[PDB]
Symmetry: D2
């Protein structure tokens, strides 16, 4: 698990929606590598539990602020809080996304459609616009989007959600092309089924949904992912180990095929 990598000493990262699951694993890895990290999520109780969990592991250069990531008020509070705590921003990890609908795409109301894009796409664009001048001031940095393997392979039941993740592939690229002038690299991850609360539904009940879903999605490595399976990639994408990489998506899905 430990890499002795210390690629983030003197860096400040915001990780949105990072009190559980993938976002929390990302924050932990950045802290392990020397970063200062601000995490956010809606519920102060989750912020508190996450901060405690991290500080119990000796990861103390972390602060947390509760807010709704699609609230323009709360977006500004998150960015300003980061500047107040640590004085600068180098890295933004847009990890937020909602998956509330489950059903046929024809049954997605216009309201739910707009809400999916508001939280899953627009809020990441808004957060990028807010952090941009601060990252640019440091001479550059990194922005990472957490999309989904469903961006490439449209899934049943949550297809509208999948479309918003396709959108993030394009948004990642567009911001990469537009922010290169500021030496800000924009990349993304596209995780497969990761065992978190959002995907609990699918794989509920041990091996039965954890063994058929395994080879129903066609996962070559024969297991579902865990949150930490995303952290090494985000750390790599935010570090100088990827200094010549921008605009790219890395699929983290155990070998499931959906593009060349």
């Amino acid at each position: 698990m430990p890499s002795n990598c210390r690629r983030f000493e003197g860096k400040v990262a915001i990780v949105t929606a990072a009190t559980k699951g993938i976002g929390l694993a990302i924050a932990e890895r950045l802290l392990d590598e020397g970063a200062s990290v601000v995490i956010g999520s809606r519920n102060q109780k989750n912020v508190d539990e996450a901060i405690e969990y991290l500080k119990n592991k000796g990861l103390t250069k972390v602060a947390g602020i509760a807010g709704h990531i699609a609230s323009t008020d709360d977006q500004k509070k998150l960015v300003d809080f980061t500047l107040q705590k640590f004085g600068k921003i180098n890295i933004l990890v847009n990890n937020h996304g909602i998956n509330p609908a489950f059903g046929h795409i024809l049954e997605v109301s216009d309201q739910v459609w707009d809400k999916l894009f508001e939280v899953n796409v627009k809020a990441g664009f808004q957060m990028t616009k807010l952090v941009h001048p601060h990252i640019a001031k440091e001479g550059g940095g990194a922005i990472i989007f957490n999309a989904s393997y469903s961006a490439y392979k449209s899934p049943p039941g949550i297809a509208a959600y999948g479309v918003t993740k396709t959108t993030l592939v394009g948004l990642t690229r567009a911001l990469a092309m537009g922010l290169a002038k500021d030496n800000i690299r924009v990349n993304g991850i596209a995780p497969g089924v990761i065992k978190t609360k959002m995907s609990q539904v699918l794989w509920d009940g041990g091996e039965d949904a954890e063994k058929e879903l395994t080879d129903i999605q066609e996962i070559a490595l024969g297991r579902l992912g865990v949150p930490d399976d995303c952290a090494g990639t985000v750390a790599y994408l935010a570090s100088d180990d990827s200094s010549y990489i921008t605009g790219e998506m890395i699929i983290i899905a155990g070998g499931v095929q959906a593009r060349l």
Copy 2:
């Protein structure tokens, strides 16, 4: 030009935003192949001129209705008008899209962002939901989305527009997967620079912008596209000549490379 193809006798198609350019060329080709076609656009004057142009060529199985494609009132009027005129719907070509912004993606306001998705993505989803039961009643049919090569290669100046076209690649796929049960095939085109009013800006002033832009985009075939360059593909995708093809995008850009 004439193909003697008559693949659409007894079929009814809606082509949105089809009084000029690509949409009008699509409607003309479907009419040439025996279809009944309803065209729409915002301005009644454009509807009138398009209907006249078509009827002067002997293409008389066409009707037109003016409306804003992002108005839910006007969407219902367009679909109901088609059912009133021709009794059924077999084919929907979502050709509408706006490109009002020009500038850096960081300067796209949240309002313009939402408007781009409302017209370029949501309205096509809304039109699909409206026509779906009618196409399904005929035993199946075709829905075609006009995306853009900029869905794959993020362009300068109109990057936000490009992201909405990336979205349509995903929406095309999602609807293909969800509407297969009704034998409704959903595919798209992704045209490069086509010489229309929307792209007049770029290639203005004869060969100078029509010869440098030619090999500034890197077009292997050494010329810009024209609206009719899209019609053969849409006709193919809506016909039984593509009866085993769904969920796919065809790039119509004269050999510009942006995916494998």
Copy 3:
């Protein structure tokens, strides 16, 4: 059904390996649209039977020559035979491909590896080099490669074959970029499971084994392909309906997902 399309009057096409299955369906469609066609395959008896099958349908502008498509002697003879019979070449359809191996990729001998590339890739490159000056002399034309959906989704059992089909995606593109100067458009089809002798092992077992295979393969349209499912696309790709399209692959797999 007929399309009544007649897009190929006065045109000459070579279709390789076209005495059965997909190649024969392609040849038949071009002949139906007015073309003169030369077909070939190894076995003179298959040539005879194909020619008689076609001529019995009134498709008499056809001629056949037996040869091995990877033999440089036979390649020259096929091209010269076409020029002698019909005076020119406008269109080459590289339909040929073999898959003798079935098993794990690690058990593919170096010899079988090289043979797969010799027939499935090199022979299409060689045929392209031979026809090129003749197509260029007519002011341009079309070359179509029959790859496979396994070019994008690596299959079990025939993975090495799949790699040769990935190669053809690249070769189609490389030739498109290099022959644009001559107005020769190079595109490809990437069929899914098409019911022919080559794929019989997968789908033989009655219409229930097929229905099972469509669910395993995740074919949205719920059926296997047939050879004619490819013919309309090749005709479209070889016609002026695709005159602004080069370097592209069209997946013909009933909605199986393997790229955006």
Copy 4:
């Protein structure tokens, strides 16, 4: 800079063609992270100079063997030499590739065509077959292919080389799917223009010819690559930081666009 990463203590890697350029940078990075590495190339003098360069930096867990990577005799000797020196193999980096041709694809002789595939593809397949039982014996490991961004964007002048790199995208995938059972992850890098002897023709001309090339190549980050730009990615792909990732290609081209 250092990363201080130490992810490879007790691991053994083979890096092919690794006495200059990208391969040497990869070997150096693995050694810096604690690995034992075997490097090879044709010329004993280059092996000597690479070994001395490394040992002068204190990287002494390295050994070298001269051989031709497409020689089955030399392939066996390279693998057996690694086992004799270090007892095991965990990691194979297939870095080798040649491009002797420059010109139009139509002028590539059949012989040069076959030689391109022999070195650039077949030798990596052969090396994979040789190392596989040894990596599998360790409970799994990693194989990395160095393809090229020209696998996705067909280049002028070296199109045939580009096709061999498209092949490697497919081969990486096929091997990923087939070696998953052994917990062997197979991934690839697809570098853009990296400043090495191989690419010198393109970028030699001073830091103004380079700046010009970055604009022609449309490199968002505005500079050419260097060998170390590849090393962090290979190390990441070979480490447990990518333990849920197999079958993927990472483009390392400073933001040049050629797939979604």
